[PDB]
Design a binder for this molecule. Structure first.
Ligand code: HKM
Ligand code: GLC
Length: 448
């Protein structure tokens, strides 16, 4: 119990979750209203993606995804089906981003991006054409229109100076044409949440929410235009990007923050910011474990009081170790391998303890996350008239998809928390690229 009592600090009651849900619903109302929008943690950024799409160009589109720790570039082909537009990834390429590129300047980083695009273009007998380019850009953006918005501030560790306060679709073109190797028509910029949602629209008109549970964690949803106070109009809906990742940054979660959270945050690339994300997201989850583990050595309850050099260094306990540890079949083989690579030699009980530390961190993530989505889904309930509200949530990200129990725990919790709602959970296929394309298809009949 000497361990079980340390890990009991991760627990959250039905009442604790409801509190978080209600507080999230409140920060969400605060971000939509003009008086409160500027100081609101939950930014509630309008995305210009609308309920009443007029046009839509059939054909081929380039899509980018910056916001993973990778940077991806792909070609997708939009056509035309019953009730909606189909899409499909046809060519794809991933590129890493070197430490010195994300350390320097925005133009140093966006220059690198331009080089990656060209490399793609050569490879595929493309370089001669200019196509409509959709850009999935997984950070907070204050949009002026579907193709203009300023990056508010980097999240998830991204660092490149001189981008905070600048038109992103700007800095993209500025580097494309700083390299007259090629040209592209930058038609749309979207969030990953939004793209994931849009990508699901085809096979489910009910899909009115998008959720990412990956490196970071965030959600978007379809708001009534009369509630979106920062866009003029009351006609139909517009997708809103909550940036629920920064929930708690005004102390909303203070009572819930554990020592390990306060330590993760201080050491992070963005202290005092993204606190709700830091309880859930992948960039953070493994580090939460690392810290829980370190305290268990200090208290002399784990690894006979002796921690490895590797275990003592920041970010050595990867998030995927949490997933693998929770996937262990009982035989401890996987937990051993992970810890052996981490320069440790763990006992039977050491491995069992590590498992319990992982389960405690990952169960908390799932529950916090459930409170958020319950917030979002219940706000939409308060604006809907059927007996039972039927809603589909489009979801992507490695934590949600790949972690063994996250999704089952998440689902059940969100369900407890959302009476008179029927929620359907759809996982997006190439959501980020196909989403950005499908959006770009529409803003093309709105332009050229
Ligand atoms: C300005 C702009 C660009 S792309 C866009 N909207 C959409 N694009 C593609 C598919 C669906 C779109 O809309 C909806 C989104 C969510 C739930 C219902 C609908 C409806 N109907 N607007
Ligand atoms: O990638 C998931 C999310 O991570 C971060 O919280 C970003 O601010 C957000 O825009 C993105 O959607």
């Amino acid at each position: 119990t000497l361990v079980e009592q340390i890990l009991a600090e991760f627990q959250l009651q039905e009442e604790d979750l409801k509190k978080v849900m209600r507080r999230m619903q409140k920060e969400m109302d605060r971000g939509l209203r003009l008086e409160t929008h500027e100081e609101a943690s939950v930014k509630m950024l309008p995305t210009y993606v609308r309920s009443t799409p007029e046009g839509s160009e059939v054909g081929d589109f380039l899509s980018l995804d910056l916001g993973g720790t990778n940077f991806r570039v792909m070609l997708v082909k939009v056509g035309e089906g019953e009730e909606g537009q189909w899409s499909v990834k046809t060519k794809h390429q991933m590129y890493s981003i070197p430490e010195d590129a994300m350390t320097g300047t925005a133009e140093m980083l966006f220059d690198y991006i331009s080089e990656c695009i060209s490399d793609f273009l050569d490879k595929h007998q493309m370089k001669h054409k200019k196509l409509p380019l959709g850009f999935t850009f997984s950070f907070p953006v204050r949009h002026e229109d579907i193709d203009k918005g300023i990056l508010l501030n980097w999240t998830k560790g991204f660092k490149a100076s001189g981008a905070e306060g600048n038109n992103v679709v700007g800095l993209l073109r500025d580097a494309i044409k700083r390299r007259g190797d090629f040209e592209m028509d930058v038609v749309a910029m979207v969030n990953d949440t939004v793209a994931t949602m849009i990508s699901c629209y085809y096979e489910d008109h009910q899909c009115e929410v998008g959720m990412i549970v990956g490196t970071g964690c965030n959600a978007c949803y379809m708001e009534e235009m009369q509630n979106v106070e920062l866009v003029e109009g009351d006609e139909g809906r517009m997708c809103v990007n909550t940036e629920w990742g920064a929930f708690g940054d005004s102390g909303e979660l203070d009572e819930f923050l554990l020592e390990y959270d306060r330590l993760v945050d201080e050491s992070s690339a963005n202290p005092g910011q993204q606190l709700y994300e830091k309880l859930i997201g992948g960039k953070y989850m493994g580090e939460l474990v690392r810290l829980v583990l370190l305290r268990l050595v200090d208290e002399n309850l784990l690894f006979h009081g002796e921690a490895s050099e590797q275990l003592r260094t920041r970010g050595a306990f990867e998030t995927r170790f949490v997933s693998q540890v929770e996937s262990d079949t009982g035989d401890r083989k996987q937990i051993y391998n992970i810890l052996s690579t981490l320069g440790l030699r763990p006992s039977t009980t050491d491995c069992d303890i590590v498992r319990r530390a992982c389960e405690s961190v990952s169960t908390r993530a799932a529950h916090m996350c459930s409170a958020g989505l319950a917030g979002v889904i219940n706000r939409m309930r308060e604006s809907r008239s059927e007996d039972v509200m039927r809603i589909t949530v489009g979801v992507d990200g490695s934590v949600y998809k790949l972690h063994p129990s996250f999704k089952e725990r998440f689902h059940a919790s969100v369900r407890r928390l959302t009476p008179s709602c029927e929620i359907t959970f759809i996982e997006s296929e190439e959501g980020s690229g196909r989403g950005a394309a499908l959006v770009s298809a529409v803003a093309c009949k709105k332009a050229c």
